[PDB]
Symmetry: C2
Subunit: 361 residues, 2 copies
């Protein structure tokens, strides 16, 4: 006849119990991440559920090598976390989508619903990349559906990273890739943002589609490009010599935004120590220098900007202030009950505390 | 809100493909049967699904390391009921994919083309083997499933097979209370001889059945003393003692069903000699309602059938349920034993021989 659900759920529960304690059920392989942590797993289960692991295990058994697999070697184009791998392996074992622990897929804004904020998008990106590398089509489709449902609410700067990973996944994520391309074309993303966030192929494709649809594709000023290249090389004296000609201004070139977004901390610091640019100036996307400083999560940049008269009460076109951006850019792990817990870099927490201080000031 | 059926079905399909090709997915253990065949299985799957396998593998890993070096002897951990290979395959398929797999036709099927193979002996034997495997492996879902399978059928099974079903139900402990109680009720309701109970069931089971038969008002006749002497002389294979007991004129082989006893439970040569004495009616019917030819067909020994026919055995007689000796020999033998493929794991061919002898005798009406 058809399917018997009771036996299927019993099988799923037994295999999930196997995954929960793999050492009590004769685990014979280990998957080591790029950080240093490792997860124990069994060769048969993952050789059956995924073709990638079957091929990798058949290749590893040919050298007569307890088998360890470096995740940083097989999947090389995206640094995946630990909880994403745990979720993917839980689905591999029990056919059940295990939810992530609180904090990983959640930001530091208690007002944020954690649906479209950056930590959740990053977790979904990691899980989708893992499902693509492991060649699990159901997980691929499910998480592509998730990102397609949420992408209309995520900010454009994160949609750029979503488009990047969608192109990384090739033809397996056609829907998400085309949707992100359409969203980026319809929006007013700077050419510098596209150049520094996307490979040359994507930039050329988006520019061709923008010029084909008759959209606004303005060229870059040559002298402004010279100032940008001078800033990218950390040559402040070159910026001084370029400004001596008075052909360009740091406000019309958004040199502060560029230095805060992409350049080094010391380069932006030395550029600010000259005082030849409006600190509260905006950009074609509507962000001020403090907003980009919040997006970068560098405490010294925010501090030096506040010591220069940066107004922190100004909002973006979407209604987000610098504190909101800083909270929604950091995950909740870095701001909760003060345990050790990997720690990562407490730079985002420092930025959040700086901006919360400036709030009540 | 609800279980995901597609993901669970894909999981079951993947693990069924694992079971169908264990060596392709790094099998690390081998279950060897009593005959000598091997089934390659993985330790993790059976340690998860079966608590028995987990407890056994935790102790087996104490001693033991090269290439697929873990072996489990089924003849030792079972050691209470000889289990075939197809039933083990079915149980392992349910362990891996959580779905029941029907055995190849012939294991649970008899050689009678008119039989529906619902209650014949091969089907009952396969059900009992799978039930015993589920009991030993500690799987309650399979236990209940096959208990219900046997319970729905037991009312249409011949009582002599109900004896074996009750034996297994007693073996399987309290995990088959319904089956055991129903089988005990069926046995005490019928008029099964005390000798058959003694030779087919343990002492405590026979004592319980006799106690309930006595307390329920049903008659339990006293075992005739001299008949017991004849039965004991036949069981020890002393035809001279049987001759001495018959020389006292106090006994009669027909009144004791000595031919039935010798054909059912004694050796071939003892029954042959007792038949050569020519001191008993060959077509005599026992209290159960069977003739000596029916008992010979149940025993599946061709020499006894030939010696019976050469002595005057009528093959056209039927039992209480309407079965002739040919139909009994058909429904008692597996269908694979009479197939057009003798190299399919050779088995005793005495059943096919008896069936064909009775078919040839039936052709000369
Ligand atoms: Cl809250
Ligand atoms: Cl809000
Ligand atoms: Cl929200
Ligand atoms: Cl962001
Ligand atoms: Cl059997
Ligand atoms: Zn959030
Ligand atoms: Zn049958």
């Amino acid at each position: 006849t058809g399917p018997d659900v009771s036996a299927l759920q019993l099988l799923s529960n037994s295999f999930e119990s196997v995954f929960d304690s793999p050492d009590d059920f004769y685990s014979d392989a280990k998957l080591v991440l790029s950080d240093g942590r490792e997860v124990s797993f069994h060769r048969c289960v993952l050789s059956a559920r995924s073709s990638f692991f079957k091929s990798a295990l058949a290749a590893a058994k040919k050298e007569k090598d307890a088998v360890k697999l470096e995740l940083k070697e097989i999947a090389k184009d995206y640094e995946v976390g630990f909880d994403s791998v745990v979720t993917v392996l839980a689905y591999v074992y029990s056919s059940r989508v295990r939810p992530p622990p609180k904090g990983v897929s959640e930001c530091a804004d208690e007002n944020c619903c954690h649906v479209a904020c950056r930590p959740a998008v990053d977790f979904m990106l990691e899980v989708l990349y893992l499902a693509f590398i492991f060649k699990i089509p159901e997980l691929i489709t499910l998480y592509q559906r998730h990102l397609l449902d949420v992408v209309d609410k995520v900010v454009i700067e994160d949609t750029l990273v979503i488009l990047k990973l969608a192109n990384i996944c090739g033809k397996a994520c056609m829907k998400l890739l085309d949707r992100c391309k359409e969203i980026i074309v319809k929006s007013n993303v700077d050419m510098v943002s596209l150049e520094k966030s996307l490979p040359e192929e994507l930039v050329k494709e988006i520019i061709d589609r923008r010029k084909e649809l008759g959209l606004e594709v303005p060229k870059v000023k040559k002298h402004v490009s010279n100032v940008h290249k001078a800033l990218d090389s950390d040559d402040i004296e070159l910026v001084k010599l370029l400004l001596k000609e008075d052909h360009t201004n740091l406000d019309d070139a958004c040199a502060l935004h560029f230095a805060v977004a992409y350049c080094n901390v010391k380069t932006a610091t030395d550029l600010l120590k000259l005082d030849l640019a409006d600190v509260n100036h905006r950009n074609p996307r509507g962000y001020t220098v403090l907003h980009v400083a919040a997006m970068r999560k560098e405490p010294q940049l925010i501090l030096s900007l506040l010591e220069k008269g940066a107004s922190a009460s100004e909002a973006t076109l979407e209604g987000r202030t610098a504190l909101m951006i800083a909270k929604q850019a950091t995950m909740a792990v870095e701001c909760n009950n003060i345990p050790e817990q990997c720690k990562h870099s407490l730079k985002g927490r420092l930025c959040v505390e700086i901006l919360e201080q400036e709030d009540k000031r």
